[PDB]
Amino acid sequence: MLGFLSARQTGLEDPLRLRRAESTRRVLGLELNKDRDVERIHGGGINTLDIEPVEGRYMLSGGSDGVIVLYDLENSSRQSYYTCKAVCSIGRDHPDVHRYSVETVQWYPHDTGMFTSSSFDKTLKVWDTNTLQTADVFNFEETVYSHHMSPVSTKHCLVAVGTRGPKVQLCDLKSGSCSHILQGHRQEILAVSWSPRYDYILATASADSRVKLWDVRRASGCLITLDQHNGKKSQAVESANTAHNGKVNGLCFTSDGLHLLTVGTDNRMRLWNSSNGENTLVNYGKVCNNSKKGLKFTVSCGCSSEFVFVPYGSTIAVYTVYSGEQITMLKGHYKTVDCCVFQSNFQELYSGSRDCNILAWVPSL
Amino acid sequence: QKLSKLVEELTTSGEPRLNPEKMKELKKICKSSEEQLSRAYRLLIAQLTQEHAEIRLSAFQIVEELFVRSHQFRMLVVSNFQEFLELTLGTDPAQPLPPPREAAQRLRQATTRAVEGWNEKFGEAYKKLALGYHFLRHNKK
């Protein structure tokens, strides 16, 4: 490294080099921090985590017991050891607490004052963070597997909601209009994800092994259906053009939004060109998932090389996105891992799991 | 070597009882060299993976005594011990299917009591003992 400091100091390399190279080095050194803990408040498994996009200070967490916990990730104590204390909590006694498992929880992008949470009680509740009261409730006729707000939409404030119904619901938080539906899937939609690049592109993955990208502005159905083979097995599209050979229970756009990572119960991850849905043929080997619900996985941001952190049974498997090389498998959970979320400021990873624990992975040294 | 000799002398189910002199000799030998214990775990995995439940109990007790006494098994069970976390999650909980659980119920109770002891015995930063105990208490104790 001292070469890196000297190169930054003398202008030989752009400081961007030291940032990104060091960010990468930090990601490769991710290790279970026993010098950091997260306060145990979930009686049930953690299904979802969400670090706020602005300032990355707070984390939401949704449990199988229906409670939403709001953690503070800043070490406000002077010690080197600290527990991420829980600021608020939608507990068992809150009048608005979810009746069943909270399946997704998300900060409103652009502002920390509001977050949204969807459950198996068939509701997507919008919360005022400050008063911690629901501002809105959208009821669905069918259990919600995942929702997602656009990280980029300064213009629209739609929430895409995937339920066991075959239809994708768009809920407009600006005047509450939960009628709009995207039609074209055939089984439960297990994962929805807005593009981080395009304001109105939504990718939706379903148990029918198909992933569709939508232009929700458009009135003419899906843009693209991801196809494993890109045409080697080509059929008049009625059942072909499956992204996977099982259910597709996970979606994640890469940071710059130019590629799409899908994980399905064929124990594969694929990398897709988000513009024409073409398969890049990145291998990734075998990625064990048998989750019957959505599988929440993330990518890294602001490193020399992009990484994807995928729950792999009871571990987090780290892969290089564009080459497939498995960096490492982070082994610290006791039961299957449900969600991992990436803290882009410090290359920290938080992962919840069915054993009612949230483990912080921080770079070593 | 001598580790295997002591393991055979202690794990033998013909006299399945805790003998203090042999255990203190093992403690002193493990304290004399750390490399005694790194292979001892390999011996203990032989005894945990053995057909006889009494040999499994003996190897569990030997692991526990080396972790709590020798100061060299502590650096195996409270550091670089993901193998220990997985063996705790597989011993009391169901063996991963198809492979079922092969231990005895008395061994399950002994492992539960050992986990409850180790929750306070060595938990300065190793809280996955308590987390596994809670998971057992809420899933397959």
Domain ranges of chain A: 1-365
Residues of A with CB under 8 A from a CB of B: 34-35, 37, 40, 331-332, 334-335, 355-357
**Rounded Cα gap, residues B137 and A129, in angstroms:** 34
Check if the beta carbon of residue B92 is closer than 8 Å to that of residue B136: yes
A264: Cβ contacts below 8 Å, ≥ 6 apart: A205, A209, A243, A244, A245, A246, A247, A248, A249, A250, A289
| CA distance, residue A332 to nearest chain B CA (Å) | 7
Residue A299 CA: distances (Å) to CA of A110, B63, B102, B138: 20, 40, 41, 32
For B132, nearest residue in chain A (alpha carbons)? A334
The 10 Å CB-count burial string (b at 16+, else e) for B28-66 is ebbeeeeebbbebbebbeebbebeebbbbbbbbbbbbbb
Helix (H, G, I), strand (E, B) or coil at A144: strand
Q: Which of B34, B29, B59, B27 is nearest to B46 (CA)?
A: B59
How far is B89 from chain A, CA to nearest CA, in Å?
A: 7
Q: Which residues of A touch B132 (CB under 8 A)?
A: 334, 355
User: To 5 degrees, how large is the angle CA A188–CA A184–CA A273?
Assistant: 90
Among A34, A331, A334, select the one facing B131 at the smallest CB separation.
Answer: A334
- Closest chain A residue to B78, measured at CA: A34
Chain A hits for B131, CB-CB cut-off 8 Å, are: 40, 334, 355-357
Partners of B89 on chain A (C-beta within 8 Å) are 334-335
DSSP state of A184: -
Query: Rg (Cα) of chain B, in Å, rounded?
Result: 15
User: CA B32, B126, B120 angle in degrees (round to 5)?
Assistant: 85
Pairs from A122-125 (Cβ < 8 Å, separation ≥ 24): A122/A163, A123/A98, A124/A159, A124/A161, A124/A171, A125/A96, A125/A98
User: Does residue A213 sit in helix, strand or coil?
Assistant: strand
- Tell me how the structure was determined: cryo-EM
For residue A315, the chain B residue with the least C-alpha distance is: B82
DSSP A295-333: -B-EE--SSSS-EEEEEETTEEEEEETTT--EEEEE---
A355/B132 touch (CB, cutoff 8 Å), yes or no: yes
CA distance B113 to chain A (A): 19
Please say whether the beta carbons of A139 and A98 come within 8 A.
no
Q: Rounded CA gap, A10 and B6, in Å?
A: 63
Task: Tell me how far apart the alpha carbons of residues A249 and A264 are, in angstroms, rounded to a whole number.
Answer: 5
Full DSSP string of A97-125: --SS-EEEEEEPTT-TTEEEEEETTSEEE
- DSSP secondary structure string, A65-102? TS-EEEEE-S--SSSS-EEE-EEEEE-TT-TT--SS-E
The amino acid occupying position A281 is L
- What torsion do the CA atoms of A343, A348, A353, A359 make, to the nearest 10 degrees? -130
Q: Which two tokens stand for residue A148?
A: 């997602």
**B5 φψ region: left (φ > 0), alpha (ψ -120 to 50), beta (else):** alpha
Query: Cβ distance B37 to B2 under 8 Å?
Result: no
Q: Classify residue B66 by its DSSP letter.
A: I
